Symmetry: C2
Subunit: 989 residues, 2 copies
Amino acid sequence: GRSLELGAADIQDLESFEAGRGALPARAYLQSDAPRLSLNGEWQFRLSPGSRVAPDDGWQLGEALNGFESLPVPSSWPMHGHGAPAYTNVQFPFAVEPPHVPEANPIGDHLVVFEAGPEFFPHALLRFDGIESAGTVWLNGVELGTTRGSRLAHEFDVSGILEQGENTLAVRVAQFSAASYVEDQDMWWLPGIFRDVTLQARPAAGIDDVFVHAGYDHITGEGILKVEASRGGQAIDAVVRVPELALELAAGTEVRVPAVEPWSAEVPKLYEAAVSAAGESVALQIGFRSIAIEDAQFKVNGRRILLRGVNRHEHHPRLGRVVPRDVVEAELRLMKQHNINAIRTSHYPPHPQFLALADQLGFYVVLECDLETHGFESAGWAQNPSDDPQWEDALVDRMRRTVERDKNHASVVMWSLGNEAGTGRNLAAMSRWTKDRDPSRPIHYEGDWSSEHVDVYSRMYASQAETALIGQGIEPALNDAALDARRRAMPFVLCEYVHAMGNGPGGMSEYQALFEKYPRLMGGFVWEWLEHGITVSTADGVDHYGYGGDFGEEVHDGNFVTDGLVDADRRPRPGLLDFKKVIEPLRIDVARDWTGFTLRNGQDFADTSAFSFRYEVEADGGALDGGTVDVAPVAPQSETVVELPGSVAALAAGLSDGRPAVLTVRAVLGADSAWADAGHEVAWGQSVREPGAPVPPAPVEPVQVQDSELTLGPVVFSRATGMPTSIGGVPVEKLGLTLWWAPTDNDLGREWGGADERPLATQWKDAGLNRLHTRLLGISANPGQDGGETLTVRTRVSAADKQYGVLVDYTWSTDGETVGLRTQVRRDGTWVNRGFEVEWARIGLEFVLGEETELVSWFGQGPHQSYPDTGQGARAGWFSLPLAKMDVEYVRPQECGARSGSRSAALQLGGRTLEICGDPFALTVRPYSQDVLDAAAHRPDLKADGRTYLYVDHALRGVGTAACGPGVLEQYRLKPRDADFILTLKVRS
Amino acid sequence: GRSLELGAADIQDLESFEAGRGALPARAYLQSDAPRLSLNGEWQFRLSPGSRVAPDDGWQLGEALNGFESLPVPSSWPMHGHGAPAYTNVQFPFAVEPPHVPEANPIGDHLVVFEAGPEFFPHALLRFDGIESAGTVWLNGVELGTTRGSRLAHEFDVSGILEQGENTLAVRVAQFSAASYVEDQDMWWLPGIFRDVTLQARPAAGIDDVFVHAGYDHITGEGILKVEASRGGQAIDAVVRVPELALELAAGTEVRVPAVEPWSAEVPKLYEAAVSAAGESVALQIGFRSIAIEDAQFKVNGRRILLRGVNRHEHHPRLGRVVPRDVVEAELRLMKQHNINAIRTSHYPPHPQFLALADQLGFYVVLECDLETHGFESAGWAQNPSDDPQWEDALVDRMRRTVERDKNHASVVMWSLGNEAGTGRNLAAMSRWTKDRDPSRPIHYEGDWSSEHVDVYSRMYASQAETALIGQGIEPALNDAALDARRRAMPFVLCEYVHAMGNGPGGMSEYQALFEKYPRLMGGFVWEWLEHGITVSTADGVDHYGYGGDFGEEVHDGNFVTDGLVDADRRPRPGLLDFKKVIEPLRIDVARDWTGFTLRNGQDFADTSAFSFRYEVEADGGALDGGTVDVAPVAPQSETVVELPGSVAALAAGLSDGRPAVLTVRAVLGADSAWADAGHEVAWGQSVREPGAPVPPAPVEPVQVQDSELTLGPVVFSRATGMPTSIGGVPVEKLGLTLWWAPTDNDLGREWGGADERPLATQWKDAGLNRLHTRLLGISANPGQDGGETLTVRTRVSAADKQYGVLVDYTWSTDGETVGLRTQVRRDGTWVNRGFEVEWARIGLEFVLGEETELVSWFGQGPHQSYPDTGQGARAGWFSLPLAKMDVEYVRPQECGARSGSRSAALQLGGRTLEICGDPFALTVRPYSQDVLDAAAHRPDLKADGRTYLYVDHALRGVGTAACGPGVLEQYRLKPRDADFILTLKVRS
Ligand code: NA
Ligand code: NA
């Protein structure tokens, strides 16, 4: 019997089910006049590969340091060259055997020397706001305690250890600990001290914790205020002063303020208040709100509200978990600018400073505890911590610390027990505690569908259909009659829906229609706000985002970090633009006769008084008229009809039959707000006078036959191919039918149900839809009129080893000036492969041109892209973009850039402009081919070859959200069918 | 109404269901004294991308050629830079719509000018032996006709077109034609004139075709001879002279020769004969044989024979379909050297010159017609030519031309209608014709399992089990009572089995046991003889074989061309070495007491008289004794017992208890034969005296504990890891358990049946078996004896996101000189993933050493590799190889190089030699890691890193033949279980 392994005692600590030891009781984050010293700055940093290899050179004392270097704190140290980021989603990065930790466990030693003034005597504390995932803290070689709960705050008492003058603070941080088993969220695994380390003095007769109770009686219009204040866990005498309400009360007593302005996301009214004791005073912002669940509805201040929300992770493309305050203010303002009123802190408490901003700019906030045991799902939740009693104290500590920190803020309207932790005893323990401490807020958890220990029914990525059932209260009952009776009486919320990976999300409209129609639906939260992209510079110094698997990770999920509405640098993806329109607070139905418009106010509290209503009339290359209309304030959930100036309606009948004109009624801010400047666009509506169907040119031109070529009008053909080689001088290198997209991220994912287990992208490859070949059948010339000949090229399209195909015929005609192309498409054989019917991505034509396009113009829906289930934010008008701005810079290159519902388009090539008219078609123009687009793993992989790839699609497919949740809806799917369309071509040289 | 496409008439020809027009009636390939002129040499060659683009510049006349260049003929023109090779297997390279051809159809114009002497007047013909796939032939601007049937010979009459003096011959060749639909074999698609173009004069009163009927009466010992000779399709008077049999008869009459020596693969007795007419005489080699199907047995000359065969494609690594005669002679001799007696010409007639060689060196030849419509299987054989009456004449022409060419040869014992053409009317038409023309030979076809139109029951890749049933005649009956009665009375043959892709094939022994035990089993043909590798030179001029998909092919099958017993350059893969032993014609069971051996003659005709029997006794580094034993000739299918010299048996009892000695009795050729030199090894047998289990060293050495390291005997450890860092001075960089191979080609293929659809390679990746991590549990030191301490390192092995694992413990001990390692392995949890139990590839240890190994020695089975279901040819002995010769150069790098059944091994590193002893283990040594081996797509991807990767496996897995056909057999599979083994380590410096 003998023992000889190194670092045993260190690991036993890492493998404890105990919460952080030594730390003071959990309290709220308060703004205090008590002297503070921030220890943020250059610290000394040493990295070790394991705990068994971690040096014991008494480094904690700060002198004779071996191998240390300066590292900024707070920070995520992989972001600074020390190691590399790693990313997994459903999977753990280590062997699952709780609570044991792997041998490859990066240990980062942190050290800093600071001097402490007399202000921090006799009593003071150290406050860590976040250490991932386990930390041991020494002050002048004395162990203070350990920290567990990476996104939770720990405070240690340094009274009697802190010396006057220079002090030495040493923190040992381990990446993986037993706590890693309960923090399995969807993100890069980035260890380190990533939040503020703070030294704060604790005066005698000071305030340790404050609990604010600000309620609103919507009937009597009275505020109900009562402020608890305590020191050392016991209630104390303190004075509460609210200047604006002109009152002065003692803590612990409950008074009713006669008239208060209630708080909401629409009107974030806050009252300045201070809680004063002898030793210190605390500064608070008080918002009067009351939350009730009544008649299966989630109500705030008496009225049902609609959550238009997103899921906000904390991420930066260069700093790790560190999100600079200016960056936080920026994104919150951006959310407000796009009609967002709710946030779910997924899947952990955010930076303490976040809560204040959510109070100030109006947001309904779902504050989620730092708990996710998603990696145990793989094995049927065997060894799940949520049900293991060994984990009870540790998990309850996580809930307590979460609730305690942010209880005072009005924005927090719900506590959430965590994400995807399964079901268990501990979850029930966590809920039970929270209902006892803070009854003012309902409780949210998605994992337990029985909804036994929560106040709202919550699901993620439920189908539009399923939601429609739940909204009507006719969803299938639970086995338990008692439990079903409770859940059927709960409001419903989608804590995650419309996955926004890559091109998408689609189907956002079908969800919103249900949100507006059924009171039981609270609305919900989009997944997610931002991409977790990380900036990388190449050998030639191109920088682009990188995703999972790009940093050498043994185990990864590729590009799933990229599912955001904005990129890592907070630049809006087209999805956010569409989202803004879907959840807009006002609906404007412009009448067809342009006499007036119908306006409905979709807000729950405010009226249409902060808005200014403008109208615009666009036609050709000029705004024909503009102005402002006077709209009497409209009550919330009410609608009126506003008549437009007679001048507008007069211009309608005034314009010629068949030329396009667009009437736009826009709701903009009357004056500056905290989150936007005046004139900012909130909601809009349109009525469009569309051009009639174009007329095919006179077939009065004959076909001139030479030895190897044909000529008709300005179009030169090839007698071998049957395809044009030149139109009005523009080099046509290729023309063919396309049935296939470059697979989006939605296509790469398996679809919800169905006998076909294969991702739609795979279905296409097996069907050979990406490798189509054309066989020429014959070229006819047929009489038109007055010597005119109409050329007809008959072809068949198919792929290798396939017996099915499609017959397409191109009949050309021209009056000598304008070229008329007609395409007929017929199915040859049954399109089934591997026992499943093959779906198409499009019915369109690919034009490859030998000259670059300098600039693209069109009339239809823009500026950004449009697909059948998307492009809601794309409005009618005239748009002109450089070729470079046509594309969309998704992290992983895929199908994007299609402008649906086009009527006409113009491509300028050198000195020539190519006009394309016809029936509604979808426009796409690229500097590179699809084979290039598909193959590309990153943006740099895309090199232009000097050609112009023009795409004109008759019918398109929906993009859906198949990456996670519902795929393409039925009405948006594209199955094999026979089709036709006419085009109008012309070249102005 | 009008038509304007180019090259319409050319394509209509390509799309005809008609056979070659203009060609003379099919006849046999005869050696004639009639004057011949070979036109092989430099020709002029022009390539065009399509038939619509193919120039009509009257190039056929040979002057004012534009864009021509010199190209050798015969040749495959992609092998000469003109285009590139393309490879598919089951799939067609173009859209399936018979008989239409793609637009991308390479057209190669061939042209040559030759002068013709007066000998070729007044009558002569042009003979093309092979044009792939369609050819049009002009002579001096006159169209002779077209050729259909790429591996079939066409002859055109040039009488009255051939001028005296200079003539100009022009051939237009198209790669794809309607005939491509019926030539869908497993190979590179290589067009061109790839066989001899020949000019032959046809004298008056000459012989056009000869049919030889040479039968053998095994009862009376009489030859039955009758030779038909004809001119212009009508019988003529000719004189047959057979010098050796001293007879002279007139053609058309049937005589019985009193005493003839019969022909067989074992005794290829041929009689010289000449058929003389006035104008010319024909030289023939006559072999007397008779084929009968009787009592469900395939009989030749009265006796049941055993087909030990292979499938021979015609391929060269540099020339395409062109296989030089010296290369053909070479491989045929190589086959004979490895006990092969049968060949299946897959899947087309071979070069005309092949048939003669198969007569001379003894081979049973299955001659297969050029027909495969395998690409229609994809769509349930819709539009299958085999059943389409439009194809009848074309398909019957293929059978006629095939039979007619090679009817005279004795080696051809069966006509085969083709491969994988499905079922149809035309197949029945082909059989019906063949039975009428040549009843002397049975008919083979695999596609129609009902076996309605054939003479033998034939299957491919049927399981060992299924074969065992068929052998006993108890296979499940057919729906048709009448048909079942016929098929149940047929002999059975596997036209393709034991797929030899990559490492393998395994399970060859279990098949052969059935072949020997059941008379109904004819034996069968291995797939296949050679790899279709193609030589490629890199930027630094490394040359290596390339496979499908490596030449830019839109559609491919990767490395499936690589499934041979030899590489493209006819270098034996280990599979051939194993195969030679499995099908050896003699079995030698050496008695245990070394007194004698049992010898059985497995041949059907010959006796043991051409052999010399040698014996050898090896022990340590010396052959102790050698000699020759006198064995009375043993009759075929009979066995005798031969006593060894008393000196041998005396040496057995003479040697110490526990030292190894190997007795080898070997059958070698007494004198030179046509295919090998005297002394060549045919069959062998062994009896082995194995060393006793090694004894664990005295645990008398204590553990010396320092700060960061441990020391026990000559082994230095690391206290952090628990792994040795040094043994006797050799740097040990790593030591760990392995459960995973680098997936072979068999592992990459789906397995036959089972709920698990996943290839075994994929099963491993999902299970995380390739990414194992170890967690240290503890290091103990326990008392041994006399101050001795036995170190024990306890660890656990697992992978990320997995809850199952394995507990392995390493207990070390040493007497100061020899190190004793013991490994205990225990399963922790159930090894199931995705609902399926996880199989292991091995139970072994990986040693990574910081020094290169110069040379590896061992005692066990060698020289080549050994796996549970393979290594039959690996014999017992002492082997020593350079590290470079340990590896096996498979085209795609995979698991290989394991020497199973090892007893001891020695690795020399610089000046140190490392000895490893113990229980039977499998040895593998590599210059690179497994991660390198797996990732490598080609041989060049393998770069040594200066380390030595040593593998010692307790238990191994079978390789099977899962790439196509049966996977690993039950007794060879490796499932999770608890195991142990002891090792003996020692370093001699
Ligand atoms: Na995600
Ligand atoms: Na093959």
